[PDB]
CSV table of C-alpha atoms in Angstrom, one decimal:
chain,number,residue,atom,x,y,z
H,1,UNK,CA,9.2,-28.2,13.0
H,2,UNK,CA,10.2,-25.2,15.1
H,3,UNK,CA,7.4,-23.9,17.3
H,4,UNK,CA,6.6,-20.2,16.5
H,5,UNK,CA,7.8,-18.3,19.5
H,6,UNK,CA,7.9,-14.6,18.2
H,7,UNK,CA,4.9,-13.1,16.4
H,8,UNK,CA,5.6,-9.6,14.8
H,9,UNK,CA,3.0,-7.3,13.5
H,10,UNK,CA,4.0,-4.6,10.9
H,11,UNK,CA,2.6,-1.2,10.7
H,12,UNK,CA,3.1,2.5,11.5
H,13,UNK,CA,2.8,4.2,14.8
H,14,UNK,CA,0.2,6.9,15.7
H,15,UNK,CA,-3.5,7.2,15.7
H,16,UNK,CA,-3.5,8.6,12.1
H,17,UNK,CA,-2.2,5.2,10.9
H,18,UNK,CA,-4.0,2.9,13.2
H,19,UNK,CA,-6.9,2.2,10.9
H,20,UNK,CA,-5.0,2.2,7.6
H,21,UNK,CA,-4.5,-0.9,5.5
H,22,UNK,CA,-0.7,-0.8,6.0
H,23,UNK,CA,-1.4,-1.6,9.7
H,24,UNK,CA,-3.1,-5.0,9.0
H,25,UNK,CA,-0.3,-6.7,10.9
H,26,UNK,CA,-0.8,-4.5,13.9
H,27,UNK,CA,-4.4,-5.4,13.9
H,28,UNK,CA,-3.6,-9.1,14.0
H,29,UNK,CA,-1.1,-8.9,16.8
H,30,UNK,CA,-3.1,-6.5,18.9
H,31,UNK,CA,-6.1,-8.7,18.7
H,32,UNK,CA,-4.0,-11.8,19.5
H,33,UNK,CA,-2.4,-10.2,22.5
H,34,UNK,CA,-5.8,-9.2,23.9
H,35,UNK,CA,-7.3,-12.6,23.2
H,36,UNK,CA,-4.7,-14.3,25.4
H,37,UNK,CA,-4.3,-11.4,27.8
H,38,UNK,CA,-0.7,-10.6,26.9
H,39,UNK,CA,0.1,-7.0,27.7
H,40,UNK,CA,1.9,-5.0,25.0
H,41,UNK,CA,4.3,-2.5,26.7
H,42,UNK,CA,6.6,0.2,25.5
H,43,UNK,CA,10.0,-1.3,24.8
H,44,UNK,CA,12.3,1.5,23.7
H,45,UNK,CA,15.4,-0.7,23.9
H,46,UNK,CA,14.1,-2.4,20.8
H,47,UNK,CA,12.3,0.5,19.3
H,48,UNK,CA,8.9,-1.1,19.7
H,49,UNK,CA,6.0,-2.3,21.8
H,50,UNK,CA,6.4,-5.8,23.0
H,51,UNK,CA,5.0,-8.5,25.3
H,52,UNK,CA,5.3,-12.0,26.4
H,53,UNK,CA,3.0,-14.7,27.7
H,54,UNK,CA,1.3,-18.0,27.4
H,55,UNK,CA,-0.6,-18.8,24.2
H,56,UNK,CA,-2.0,-22.3,24.2
H,57,UNK,CA,0.7,-23.7,26.5
H,58,UNK,CA,3.7,-22.0,25.0
H,59,UNK,CA,5.7,-18.9,26.0
H,60,UNK,CA,5.4,-16.5,23.0
H,61,UNK,CA,6.8,-13.0,22.5
H,62,UNK,CA,4.8,-10.4,20.6
H,63,UNK,CA,6.3,-7.4,18.9
H,64,UNK,CA,5.1,-4.3,17.2
H,65,UNK,CA,8.0,-2.2,15.7
H,66,UNK,CA,7.5,1.6,16.4
H,67,UNK,CA,10.2,2.6,13.9
H,68,UNK,CA,7.7,3.3,11.1
H,69,UNK,CA,7.1,0.6,8.5
H,70,UNK,CA,10.2,1.1,6.3
H,71,UNK,CA,12.5,0.8,9.3
H,72,UNK,CA,11.0,-2.2,10.9
H,73,UNK,CA,14.2,-4.1,10.9
H,74,UNK,CA,15.6,-1.7,13.5
H,75,UNK,CA,13.3,-3.3,16.0
H,76,UNK,CA,12.8,-6.9,14.7
H,77,UNK,CA,16.5,-7.6,14.1
H,78,UNK,CA,18.0,-6.6,17.5
H,79,UNK,CA,14.9,-8.1,19.4
H,80,UNK,CA,15.2,-11.5,17.7
H,81,UNK,CA,19.0,-11.5,18.2
H,82,UNK,CA,18.8,-10.5,21.9
H,83,UNK,CA,16.3,-13.2,22.7
H,84,UNK,CA,18.2,-15.6,20.4
H,85,UNK,CA,15.0,-16.4,18.4
H,86,UNK,CA,15.8,-18.1,15.1
H,87,UNK,CA,13.9,-16.9,11.9
H,88,UNK,CA,12.2,-20.3,11.7
H,89,UNK,CA,10.5,-19.5,15.0
H,90,UNK,CA,9.2,-16.1,13.8
H,91,UNK,CA,5.9,-15.2,12.2
H,92,UNK,CA,5.5,-11.8,10.7
H,93,UNK,CA,2.0,-10.5,10.0
H,94,UNK,CA,1.7,-7.9,7.3
H,95,UNK,CA,-0.6,-6.4,4.7
H,96,UNK,CA,-0.4,-8.0,1.2
H,97,UNK,CA,-1.3,-5.9,-1.8
H,98,UNK,CA,-1.4,-8.9,-4.1
H,99,UNK,CA,-4.3,-10.6,-2.3
H,100,UNK,CA,-7.8,-9.2,-2.0
H,101,UNK,CA,-9.7,-8.4,1.3
H,102,UNK,CA,-10.8,-11.6,2.8
H,103,UNK,CA,-7.8,-13.6,1.5
H,104,UNK,CA,-5.2,-14.7,4.0
H,105,UNK,CA,-2.2,-16.9,3.5
H,106,UNK,CA,0.6,-18.4,5.6
H,107,UNK,CA,3.9,-18.4,3.7
H,108,UNK,CA,7.3,-19.7,4.6
H,109,UNK,CA,10.4,-18.1,3.1
H,110,UNK,CA,10.8,-16.1,-0.1
H,111,UNK,CA,11.5,-12.4,-0.5
H,112,UNK,CA,9.8,-9.1,0.4
H,113,UNK,CA,7.4,-9.1,-2.6
H,114,UNK,CA,7.8,-5.3,-2.7
H,115,UNK,CA,6.6,-4.9,0.9
H,116,UNK,CA,8.7,-2.1,2.4
H,117,UNK,CA,8.6,-3.5,6.0
H,118,UNK,CA,9.8,-7.0,4.9
H,119,UNK,CA,12.4,-5.2,2.7
H,120,UNK,CA,14.0,-3.9,5.9
H,121,UNK,CA,14.0,-7.3,7.6
H,122,UNK,CA,15.0,-10.0,5.1
H,123,UNK,CA,18.5,-8.6,4.6
H,124,UNK,CA,19.4,-9.1,8.2
H,125,UNK,CA,17.8,-12.3,9.4
H,126,UNK,CA,17.4,-13.9,6.0
H,127,UNK,CA,14.2,-15.1,4.4
H,128,UNK,CA,13.3,-18.2,6.4
H,129,UNK,CA,10.6,-16.8,8.7
H,130,UNK,CA,6.9,-17.3,8.3
H,131,UNK,CA,4.6,-14.6,7.1
H,132,UNK,CA,0.9,-14.1,7.6
H,133,UNK,CA,-0.1,-12.3,4.4
H,134,UNK,CA,-3.3,-10.4,5.1
H,135,UNK,CA,-4.9,-9.4,1.8
H,136,UNK,CA,-5.7,-5.7,1.4
H,137,UNK,CA,-6.4,-5.4,-2.3
H,138,UNK,CA,-4.5,-3.6,-5.0
H,139,UNK,CA,-5.7,-0.2,-6.2
H,140,UNK,CA,-5.4,-0.8,-10.0
H,141,UNK,CA,-2.2,1.2,-10.7
H,142,UNK,CA,1.3,1.8,-9.3
H,143,UNK,CA,0.6,5.4,-8.7
H,144,UNK,CA,-2.2,4.9,-6.3
H,145,UNK,CA,-0.5,2.2,-4.1
H,146,UNK,CA,0.8,4.7,-1.5
H,147,UNK,CA,-2.7,6.2,-1.0
H,148,UNK,CA,-4.3,2.8,-0.8
H,149,UNK,CA,-1.9,1.3,1.8
H,150,UNK,CA,-1.9,4.5,3.8
H,151,UNK,CA,-5.7,4.9,3.6
H,152,UNK,CA,-8.6,3.4,5.6
H,153,UNK,CA,-10.6,0.7,3.9
H,154,UNK,CA,-14.4,1.1,3.5
H,155,UNK,CA,-16.7,-1.0,5.7
H,156,UNK,CA,-17.3,-3.8,3.3
H,157,UNK,CA,-13.5,-4.5,2.8
H,158,UNK,CA,-12.7,-4.0,6.4
H,159,UNK,CA,-15.3,-6.7,7.4
H,160,UNK,CA,-13.6,-9.0,4.9
H,161,UNK,CA,-10.1,-8.4,6.3
H,162,UNK,CA,-11.5,-8.7,9.9
H,163,UNK,CA,-13.1,-12.1,9.0
H,164,UNK,CA,-9.7,-13.3,7.5
H,165,UNK,CA,-7.8,-12.1,10.7
H,166,UNK,CA,-10.4,-13.8,13.0
H,167,UNK,CA,-9.8,-17.0,11.1
H,168,UNK,CA,-6.0,-16.8,11.4
H,169,UNK,CA,-6.3,-16.0,15.1
H,170,UNK,CA,-8.1,-19.3,15.5
H,171,UNK,CA,-5.1,-21.1,14.0
H,172,UNK,CA,-2.4,-19.6,16.2
H,173,UNK,CA,-2.6,-22.7,18.5
H,174,UNK,CA,-1.2,-24.9,15.6
H,175,UNK,CA,1.5,-22.4,14.9
H,176,UNK,CA,2.8,-22.1,18.5
H,177,UNK,CA,2.5,-25.9,18.9
H,178,UNK,CA,4.9,-26.4,15.9
H,179,UNK,CA,2.1,-27.7,13.4
H,180,UNK,CA,3.1,-25.3,10.7
H,181,UNK,CA,2.0,-27.5,7.6
H,182,UNK,CA,-1.4,-28.0,9.3
H,183,UNK,CA,-1.7,-24.3,10.1
H,184,UNK,CA,-0.8,-23.4,6.5
H,185,UNK,CA,-3.4,-25.8,5.0
H,186,UNK,CA,-6.1,-24.5,7.3
H,187,UNK,CA,-5.3,-20.8,7.1
H,188,UNK,CA,-4.9,-20.9,3.3
H,189,UNK,CA,-8.2,-22.6,2.8
H,190,UNK,CA,-10.1,-19.7,4.3
H,191,UNK,CA,-12.9,-18.1,2.2
H,192,UNK,CA,-15.3,-15.6,3.7
H,193,UNK,CA,-18.8,-16.5,4.9
């Protein structure tokens, strides 16, 4: 299998969004970057914040689109094209309404599932990239989805999501080493302590 060589976190820019559930992907990638001492720098050519460095023996690029969520493809698409990174070598971390806080899954392929960041990406690179689906819960009804994803979780739910993210961070070594089925088994088996 392709090694994962580009890890993208989805989210919105600005301090008013930094703690909102829709930035779960940013939380994952920011934490990963700091764990391996990869510096995320302003990258206006690709409408994002990006870095590059060694993660467990492999040279990996990290990307945070600064386009706002619904326009994420304006960063991800030209970045991945410029560095000639195939979709199969890309992992995209994002919030997942259909899983609860504390649930985290690695998925390969498929569509956007209504996620408006993924919606802006799949059309242009196709579906065959990996996704880290970070459960943020669903608020009961369709009307309250926007307020849920653009709001801050309470403490209890935030701990659960943080626990799930910690767990996936510990499996990034398998991902960058090309052991995607192993990583999928091990991520998808997580349950909180």
